[PDB]
């Protein structure tokens, strides 16, 4: 229930209730930023990677 | 503080009496930052002064804190394991921390309902001495007297 | 004066006096004073003879309270007990009935702590 799990969040054959956000890259269901479509873990990487437009290290 | 002596913190003078002792004790009645309460309480106390005694409020306030002002406290010194209570002098900037505080206690021990009248009537008995705040001074002073035995560790 | 048949609120705010009445609180106390137009300030020791009668005839006749109310509460529970439902099994054992905590807390309907371990 890892592989097949990802292909379940693209179908939505039943109620909209059973719909949830899924990490595009990895496949996590927890900590998925509705802005990126990524999970807290990797979007951090792709944030070290500068492959994320605009996204920059912040300090104040 | 192990590095520097840590210079004492200077607070701003009163806004009605212009004195660095008044506000020094105000923030002492102050709880959680509500500087207003303790201030109002304080003055409503000095209004009790001018009603009970024809004296001037700040006068009975200067003489009150002075009375509950510890001359010689008792502290603890370590001399090779053994742990005594070596008495000695009370730093001139401690007498002021304590005294202003030691009125706070007994005024919060009073049966009186309103807070103004607990610091008012208490400061009217501190300048007298018979107050139950000075009875927190007379006590610690006794602990030093009776301990004047182990005085040869006065450092 | 005995208002709830046997309950006697006296010597205090007439509005708050009705609070100690089983079935009356802080919302029904502001209602009976406005339907009989009575002073919510004056104490109970001093009011019209027709006012003790006024609130006694009204209040004790407006709805259910006192002991006949507690009476029904027990029954309502005794109905959750008889057939034996879930919102019944929670009275029947004494645990909380809102699916709350039981692994910790819940001492309100679990009594004092028992330890043993």
């Amino acid at each position: 229930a890892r592989k097949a799990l990802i292909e379940k969040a693209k179908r939505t054959p039943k109620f909209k209730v059973r719909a949830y956000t899924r990490c595009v890259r990895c496949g996590r269901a927890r900590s998925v930023y509705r802005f990126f479509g990524l999970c807290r873990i990797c979007l951090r990487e792709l944030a070290h990677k500068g492959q994320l437009p605009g996204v920059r290290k912040a300090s104040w | 503080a192990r590095r520097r002596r840590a210079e004492v913190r200077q607070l701003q003078p009163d806004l009605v009496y212009g004195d660095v002792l008044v506000t020094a004790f105000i923030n002492k009645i102050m709880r959680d930052g509500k500087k207003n309460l303790a201030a109002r309480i304080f003055y409503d106390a000095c209004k009790i002064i001018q009603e009970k005694t024809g004296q001037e409020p700040l006068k009975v306030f200067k003489q009150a804190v002075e009375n509950v002002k510890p001359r010689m406290e008792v502290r603890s010194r370590r001399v090779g394991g053994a742990n005594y209570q070596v008495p000695m002098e009370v730093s001139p900037r401690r007498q002021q921390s304590l005294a202003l505080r030691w009125l706070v206690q007994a005024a919060n021990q009073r049966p009186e309902r309103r807070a103004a009248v607990r610091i008012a009537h208490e400061l009217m008995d501190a300048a007298e001495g018979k107050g139950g705040a000075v009875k927190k001074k007379e006590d610690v002073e006794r602990m030093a007297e009776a301990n004047r035995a182990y005085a040869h560790y006065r450092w | 004066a005995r208002i709830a048949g046997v309950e006697i609120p006296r010597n205090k705010r007439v509005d708050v006096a009705l609070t100690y009445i089983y079935g009356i609180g802080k919302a029904r106390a502001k209602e009976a004073l406005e339907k009989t137009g009575i002073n919510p300030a004056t104490r109970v020791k001093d009011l019209t003879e027709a006012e003790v009668v006024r609130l006694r005839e009204y209040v004790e006749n407006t709805w259910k309270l006192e002991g006949e109310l507690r009476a029904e509460v027990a029954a309502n529970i005794k109905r959750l007990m008889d057939i034996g439902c879930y919102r019944g099994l929670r009275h029947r054992r004494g645990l909380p009935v809102r699916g709350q905590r039981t692994r910790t807390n819940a001492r309100t309907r679990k009594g004092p702590r028992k330890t043993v371990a």
């Binding site: - | 806004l15 009605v16 207003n36 | -």
Partner: protein
Amino acid sequence: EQYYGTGRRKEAVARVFLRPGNGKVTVNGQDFNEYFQGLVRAVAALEPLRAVDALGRFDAYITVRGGGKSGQIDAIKLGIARALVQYNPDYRAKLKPLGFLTRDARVVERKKYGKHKARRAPQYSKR
């Protein structure tokens, strides 16, 4: 004719319009003592006026905004000081020393992460 300075304090900034006259002190409308009803911290604002004896000779229409109530009075201090030092540069020799022309950068420091209140670590444990 006019005097002006610019004093700030914790987001709460304040302008200062000085004009020769009575002792009138209107701040964004609002009578002076009125806009600080029941606030002992008030009377501290008009401090740079008794250090110059020109309290009963100068009105002043203030325009403060931002921050809380008590912090504002601090943005009126820096302002009244800069206003009576502009049209009067000589009052500065005996003004700055007593302490009246300083920003005072004491600001609520950012809350840290791993804390509730920046300098507030979760009640430690070990059991």
